[PDB]
Design a protein around this motif. Structure first.
Motif, PDB file in Angstrom:
ATOM      1  N   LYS D 182       0.824  -1.236   0.000  1.00 53.36           N
ATOM      2  CA  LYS D 182       0.000   0.000   0.000  1.00 53.36           C
ATOM      3  C   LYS D 182       0.852   1.278   0.000  1.00 53.36           C
ATOM      4  O   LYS D 182       0.261   2.373   0.096  1.00 53.36           O
ATOM      5  CB  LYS D 182      -0.954  -0.024   1.192  1.00 53.36           C
ATOM      6  N   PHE D 183       2.176   1.193  -0.143  1.00 58.47           N
ATOM      7  CA  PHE D 183       3.042   2.400  -0.129  1.00 58.47           C
ATOM      8  C   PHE D 183       2.595   3.372  -1.231  1.00 58.47           C
ATOM      9  O   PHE D 183       2.094   2.936  -2.299  1.00 58.47           O
ATOM     10  CB  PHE D 183       4.531   2.046  -0.230  1.00 58.47           C
ATOM     11  N   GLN D 184       2.763   4.659  -0.976  1.00 58.81           N
ATOM     12  CA  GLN D 184       2.218   5.737  -1.845  1.00 58.81           C
ATOM     13  C   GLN D 184       3.061   5.903  -3.104  1.00 58.81           C
ATOM     14  O   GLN D 184       2.491   6.338  -4.126  1.00 58.81           O
ATOM     15  CB  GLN D 184       2.119   7.048  -1.074  1.00 58.81           C
ATOM     16  N   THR D 213      -0.227   2.497   5.241  1.00 61.78           N
ATOM     17  CA  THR D 213       0.830   2.123   4.275  1.00 61.78           C
ATOM     18  C   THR D 213       1.291   0.691   4.533  1.00 61.78           C
ATOM     19  O   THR D 213       1.044   0.148   5.616  1.00 61.78           O
ATOM     20  CB  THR D 213       2.002   3.107   4.339  1.00 61.78           C
ATOM     21  N   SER D 214       1.979   0.101   3.567  1.00 58.50           N
ATOM     22  CA  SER D 214       2.637  -1.205   3.771  1.00 58.50           C
ATOM     23  C   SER D 214       3.699  -1.415   2.704  1.00 58.50           C
ATOM     24  O   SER D 214       3.632  -0.806   1.620  1.00 58.50           O
ATOM     25  CB  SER D 214       1.644  -2.343   3.776  1.00 58.50           C
ATOM     26  N   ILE D 215       4.642  -2.276   3.020  1.00 59.91           N
ATOM     27  CA  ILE D 215       5.612  -2.797   2.033  1.00 59.91           C
ATOM     28  C   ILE D 215       5.782  -4.274   2.358  1.00 59.91           C
ATOM     29  O   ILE D 215       6.083  -4.609   3.511  1.00 59.91           O
ATOM     30  CB  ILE D 215       6.941  -2.016   2.037  1.00 59.91           C
ATOM     31  N   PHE D 216       5.516  -5.125   1.375  1.00 58.83           N
ATOM     32  CA  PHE D 216       5.660  -6.590   1.518  1.00 58.83           C
ATOM     33  C   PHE D 216       6.519  -7.119   0.378  1.00 58.83           C
ATOM     34  O   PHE D 216       6.328  -6.720  -0.780  1.00 58.83           O
ATOM     35  CB  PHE D 216       4.293  -7.266   1.547  1.00 58.83           C
ATOM     36  N   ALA D 332       6.172  -4.737   6.475  1.00 55.68           N
ATOM     37  CA  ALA D 332       5.748  -3.806   7.534  1.00 55.68           C
ATOM     38  C   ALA D 332       4.465  -3.134   7.068  1.00 55.68           C
ATOM     39  O   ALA D 332       4.364  -2.762   5.869  1.00 55.68           O
ATOM     40  CB  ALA D 332       6.846  -2.808   7.806  1.00 55.68           C
ATOM     41  N   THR D 333       3.519  -2.969   7.980  1.00 55.95           N
ATOM     42  CA  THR D 333       2.196  -2.414   7.643  1.00 55.95           C
ATOM     43  C   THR D 333       1.718  -1.510   8.774  1.00 55.95           C
ATOM     44  O   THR D 333       1.967  -1.816   9.940  1.00 55.95           O
ATOM     45  CB  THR D 333       1.237  -3.560   7.285  1.00 55.95           C
ATOM     46  N   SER D 334       1.024  -0.437   8.428  1.00 56.95           N
ATOM     47  CA  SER D 334       0.295   0.389   9.418  1.00 56.95           C
ATOM     48  C   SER D 334      -0.642  -0.521  10.222  1.00 56.95           C
ATOM     49  O   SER D 334      -1.288  -1.395   9.643  1.00 56.95           O
ATOM     50  CB  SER D 334      -0.469   1.495   8.747  1.00 56.95           C
ATOM     51  N   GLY D 355       1.236   8.003  10.743  1.00 57.62           N
ATOM     52  CA  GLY D 355       1.943   7.435   9.586  1.00 57.62           C
ATOM     53  C   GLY D 355       3.238   6.757  10.002  1.00 57.62           C
ATOM     54  O   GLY D 355       3.794   7.076  11.073  1.00 57.62           O
ATOM     55  N   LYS D 356       3.726   5.857   9.155  1.00 55.39           N
ATOM     56  CA  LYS D 356       5.018   5.182   9.374  1.00 55.39           C
ATOM     57  C   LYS D 356       5.853   5.250   8.098  1.00 55.39           C
ATOM     58  O   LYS D 356       5.314   5.555   7.030  1.00 55.39           O
ATOM     59  CB  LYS D 356       4.772   3.746   9.824  1.00 55.39           C
ATOM     60  N   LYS D 357       7.142   4.940   8.205  1.00 54.55           N
ATOM     61  CA  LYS D 357       7.993   4.816   7.000  1.00 54.55           C
ATOM     62  C   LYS D 357       7.719   3.454   6.380  1.00 54.55           C
ATOM     63  O   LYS D 357       7.721   2.445   7.087  1.00 54.55           O
ATOM     64  CB  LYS D 357       9.473   4.966   7.349  1.00 54.55           C
ATOM     65  N   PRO D 358       7.459   3.383   5.056  1.00 60.49           N
ATOM     66  CA  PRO D 358       7.271   2.096   4.388  1.00 60.49           C
ATOM     67  C   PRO D 358       8.623   1.451   4.066  1.00 60.49           C
ATOM     68  O   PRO D 358       9.028   1.392   2.913  1.00 60.49           O
ATOM     69  CB  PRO D 358       6.478   2.487   3.139  1.00 60.49           C
ATOM     70  N   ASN D 359       9.300   0.980   5.109  1.00 56.14           N
ATOM     71  CA  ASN D 359      10.589   0.276   4.944  1.00 56.14           C
ATOM     72  C   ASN D 359      10.706  -0.794   6.015  1.00 56.14           C
ATOM     73  O   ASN D 359       9.907  -0.812   6.989  1.00 56.14           O
ATOM     74  CB  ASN D 359      11.792   1.219   4.840  1.00 56.14           C
ATOM     75  N   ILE D 360      11.633  -1.714   5.788  1.00 59.65           N
ATOM     76  CA  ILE D 360      11.827  -2.878   6.687  1.00 59.65           C
ATOM     77  C   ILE D 360      13.198  -3.483   6.417  1.00 59.65           C
ATOM     78  O   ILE D 360      13.595  -3.600   5.254  1.00 59.65           O
ATOM     79  CB  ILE D 360      10.709  -3.923   6.535  1.00 59.65           C
ATOM     80  N   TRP D 361      13.867  -3.872   7.493  1.00 56.95           N
ATOM     81  CA  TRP D 361      15.007  -4.807   7.464  1.00 56.95           C
ATOM     82  C   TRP D 361      14.492  -6.159   7.948  1.00 56.95           C
ATOM     83  O   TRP D 361      13.983  -6.222   9.078  1.00 56.95           O
ATOM     84  CB  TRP D 361      16.147  -4.292   8.339  1.00 56.95           C
ATOM     85  N   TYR D 362      14.596  -7.206   7.135  1.00 60.36           N
ATOM     86  CA  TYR D 362      14.245  -8.556   7.607  1.00 60.36           C
ATOM     87  C   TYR D 362      15.279  -9.550   7.094  1.00 60.36           C
ATOM     88  O   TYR D 362      16.003  -9.292   6.110  1.00 60.36           O
ATOM     89  CB  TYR D 362      12.810  -8.950   7.248  1.00 60.36           C
TER      90      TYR D 362
END
Lengths: 384, 399, 404, 388
Positions: D182-184, D213-216, D332-334, D355-362
């Protein structure tokens, strides 16, 4: 007496077991001591102590003399004057500083023994023989060859081979061969017989080539008033101080010297004393330890309770009902040539000394964990 | 009937109690006198803490741990033990042969390629060194003095655990050290080109370890790091809780192309005034200058002996060995540090490095290192704590 | 059976791994609990510094690391080189002579017990027996704890004879945060005791915090008398190791001084600890009411009455009274072996009559009973003394996997 | 034949040692599992005791080769982006702050490379720090992807990793941007670490936070043995650690092969086919039911969110997997995307709709965060075959 027989009958097995158990304990103790007999503070010949005679603080003293009894008021006046005054004014009775010249006046003589010490109107005073603890003494003024006979009763703690000691009779005689320059000797005889006597010919000045020796003759009595026959009893002779100019010693004794391994005290020419070293100050004249308390480990050896009090002690093994020993203090020059003496930098071995001594003869052997014989084998009760 | 047996046991314990009782006043005075002496020493050292060779924060050393030549080594490993015959064969060949032929064991020239054969593997630890038929040989560890080591061949993440016993001279907080258990692990982040590491573990734990992945050629962007985990034990086999013990990390050599360092350590870095060794980014090393040759890259002194004053700083005995040393102040029963050697290019960009004209800072290096962790603090006049506060003995009870 | 023993050592190691992981997980919480208590204690001592010359405060602020005030369920084992007394003999003695009046009123009045009736051959037991207000005397009161249940073992001792008490089943007591599992305490009759008789009764309470009742009383008061008991003790941890005291505060409370009688501690290991405003001080190595009596308000300089009456501050002499510090001090002690002598003495034994407080109508030379109740415990009577309950934790050491 | 005889003689000599090593480890594992059964409902223990036959903890020296149907990014472009916008302040302090990188500066035509280029705290940035390593050296290859685009990473030069005692020689991993993200923005930066155990940094961040927002990223992977044959997992444990939940943000795994394995006492559970902190936050002790603070402070157990923390299990779970081809989506997701605001933990002063930053370290690796999990490192040896 049937009731008493039934009581003794009921008690007999318990008393017999108590005796057998103590005998087993003593034999085990002596077996271990055999392994340590040449280690510091151990008797060189392991032995039990069958004379249990360590403290009698509540004893009663009765005194006879062929000298003079001294008034308590006269003893007080003498302590308040001359060389002992500074300490007296600080509520301290300093026996070794007492100038006996102030005991020699006709008005000082009492018709019977009177007690003095840090009790009654001087409760809370200190003395040099007790610290803060209470000590009481009767006083006599003696010439050479004169004596006082002390009878001690009201004994609470003392036994010989498990038999209660009820009375001790002790005759103190001024040895005429004493070399003190004065006319008189003060004996302060403590009511606790285990504390012994303070003997002084001190006139307020030290004396060269001087000595004071007191002969001691004693018999111990059981509850029936019968003399007790010692059987290798150990008599403790502790606090035999040797300074560069002064030797305390025992001599002319009825038994055999018993060495404590590592002690300064040995036997030479029939005298018990610090034969080879001084024992006053660590590192002076071969002394291992300082006799008074200071920063040094093992300092303060010269005390009833110090763990290394054996450093200045020996013992005499005695038998029979009548025993004796002479104890005293003598200038080093009376004992040996100056060429034979330890040389301590800055100290002159010919320095005069005070002709006085505190000594005691008791069962408090200063060797470590000497096992005590406290139980007699019980006798079967006899039915009336 | 066994009342006699318990009496004999009690009488023996009474004799031992009497011995401890007699010794207590001597031990107590010895302790108090040393404490007074140390406090006076630290008061004087406060006045000199910013002079060359002095700890910048005055401290006593309560870890007395600098000489254990008679220690016994027992070794376990999840790698391979190496035959003494295989270690001898490797020294006799390739890059260490010239020195071997001169009766010198040159550990930093040993090509470990000749330790990697199946028939080099022993079923248990074997000792090698300048002893027995090589008595009177020299080594690069202690010159003419006798040294012995057990050898393992390890891959990344593999370890050897050394148990050192028969310790004679070492104390921590005045408690005798009877056993040291020390685990050496090859750090998988090591960048050496090969798969294998030789560890030579000295029988004297104060001499530490020789770690090598060297296969006869230098390597650019290389490193070798060994993790060290250790517990010290008292005469009762109980772990000793360090209390601000000073762990000496000496001989941290920095050449124009090479940095020896400690990192990932328990405890806190302790600076020696005037030392090349400092702390940066959790690493202990020569942070600002080289320390190899006088006048090169800011080095005050030459690490090897020559005609120059202060030369030969890098020796157990040199008066200025502090020039290449620091310490770590440590507490607790379990301590650890990683020690190793790395190409300078792994630590910083060439633009940040000291310039030695005519020397290339990107030059390859040998992936090997000699290091030791011990109590031999290289700072001057550090007072030792040798006496523990004694406890009065407790009297046994008559049965 | 190589495999069989390798499996046994593996099972032991895997269990120790689980335990190590538990101790590892718990260590941060234990360390924070220790650090937080240390912070709290240091703050408490900084405040106490401002009040050290106020009534009921230690003159030298100190924490108490000896937590030792409550052991009603303790078990007592006793040895002696004197005689154990039959519970039936102790009961018979309470029923006769000077304690009979109170006995017939269902009160055990220990300070009235005439020990003459404990001195017969048939009074001797082969082992310790308990007596007190329990069992068929559950409804009875005693002078030790009123209606609360108290039990004691009894011995008959001569001068220099002793009883050694081993106290176990301890539930609430700690030293430097270490649980106390056993206390070994030797009671010796001091031969310097001046009582007229040969014998002493010791009643040793099963709760060690209640201490001992010592008596040479034979039904008549004694002039120039005393009874002193030497106390030698070692405390032990759960592993049976001696605990080294580290400036532990030993409370010496209820040091009563009447016009003719002084209770005191002497011959002690450690250093006297003064409570500001207390009657109790130190003189000539003795801890006692040095300068005033403490029995009755306005008699011989006493501020307060020791027993409860209409007067403010009366009843100071109780475990619970807020001003019990008026008759208490403490001794700061270290090491595994500590000692103190406690007893009661005629005033004339301590000081000249000319130096004594004057109470109109009372003769300071009057005889007293040679008996005493005393206790030595951690119940410091100073106010707001912070307790040390946490020991500094040590990080756990990981066990080693066994080989085959 | 030839010198296969010499190799046969070597394998013959080694066989008894290898067999004993296998039997001794099997005895040790069985003892470990017997003890673990007694502690399975205690904090930090797997609720179903298991050995770990995937030994896959660290590969710092691995080599990365990358293909993509998006764009490779020049190392110079990645450097330029770190030096600008929201990551500039940290860059100027010699810190690569991956979660502050504004990817807007990677979107220019001149930023595109013809092949993968490495960037990180090495070479001219040796001694720099990063948010994924502290001071330790990390290197990554970078791609710019749209939704549905992918990069395939081939990792070789593996030194430390085994599956049931078999050496892992190659790992092939395909990373795909989930189109349901869902990132913009239009683009995702993937920073793919050369050490496969470090995983990926995925970002659509353009310098401001985003609501709802989300990033997958979909992850598809196969592990290969020394012969280049796929390794058939047999109840391998895949660690999914550092699943952070703040008041407004949930990191989660979903769409996975295999079965979720709970760590007793962990914030991480399974709900509606998603692995995440299901009932509490895990950011700050006492906020939204969190037992512990994820960063180090004065509190006991603080700093749980680290590779080495003893209680890192607080933010971890595992997935038990079999077969040669496995997959999981991580992102990561809201919080508002996962549940109604009425169902969320309440943290005073914090707005759960922030709001959150649409980023992730995994990362996905074998470093199971449960305590005392025994490793299978030895395979049963096969008798050697004598040639001809």
């Amino acid at each position: 007496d049937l009731a008493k027989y039934q009581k003794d009958l009921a008690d007999y097995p318990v008393k017999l077991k108590a005796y057998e158990d103590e005998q087993t304990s003593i034999k085990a103790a002596l077996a271990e001591l055999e392994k340590h007999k040449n280690e510091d503070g151990n008797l060189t010949e392991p032995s039990a102590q069958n004379l249990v005679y360590d403290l009698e603080p509540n004893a009663n003293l009765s005194l006879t003399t062929d000298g003079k009894f001294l008034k308590a008021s006269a003893v007080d006046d003498a302590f308040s004057k001359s060389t002992s005054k500074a300490k007296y004014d600080q509520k301290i009775l300093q026996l070794d500083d007492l100038d006996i010249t102030n005991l020699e006046q006709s008005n000082d003589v009492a018709s019977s023994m009177e007690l003095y010490g840090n009790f009654g109107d001087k409760a809370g005073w200190s003395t040099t023989v007790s610290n803060n603890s209470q000590v009481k003494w009767g006083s006599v003024l003696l010439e050479r060859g004169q004596s006082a006979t002390a009878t001690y009763t009201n004994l609470q703690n003392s036994y010989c081979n498990g038999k209660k000691i009820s009375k001790i009779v002790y005759k103190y005689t001024v040895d005429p061969k004493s070399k003190f320059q004065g006319q008189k000797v003060w004996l302060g005889i403590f009511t606790d017989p285990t504390l012994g006597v303070f003997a002084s010919a001190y006139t307020g000045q030290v004396e060269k080539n001087t000595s004071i020796f007191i002969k001691n003759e004693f018999t111990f009595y059981d509850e029936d008033g019968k003399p007790i026959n010692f059987d290798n009893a150990l008599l403790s002779v502790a606090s035999l101080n040797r300074e560069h100019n002064s030797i305390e010693m025992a001599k002319d004794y009825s038994g055999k010297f018993v060495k404590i391994s590592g002690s300064s005290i040995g036997e030479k020419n029939g005298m018990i004393y610090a034969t080879d070293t001084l024992n006053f100050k660590q590192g002076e004249g071969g002394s291992r330890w300082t006799m008074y308390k200071n920063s040094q480990a093992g300092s303060g050896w010269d005390s009833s309770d110090a763990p290394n009090s054996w450093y200045g002690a020996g013992a005499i093994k005695m038998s029979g009902p009548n025993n004796y020993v002479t104890v005293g203090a003598t200038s080093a020059t009376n004992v040996m040539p100056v060429s034979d003496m330890p040389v301590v930098p800055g100290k002159d071995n010919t320095d005069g000394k005070k002709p006085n001594i505190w000594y005691s003869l008791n069962g408090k052997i200063r060797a470590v964990n000497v096992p005590k014989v406290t139980k007699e084998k019980p006798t079967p009760p006899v039915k009336p």
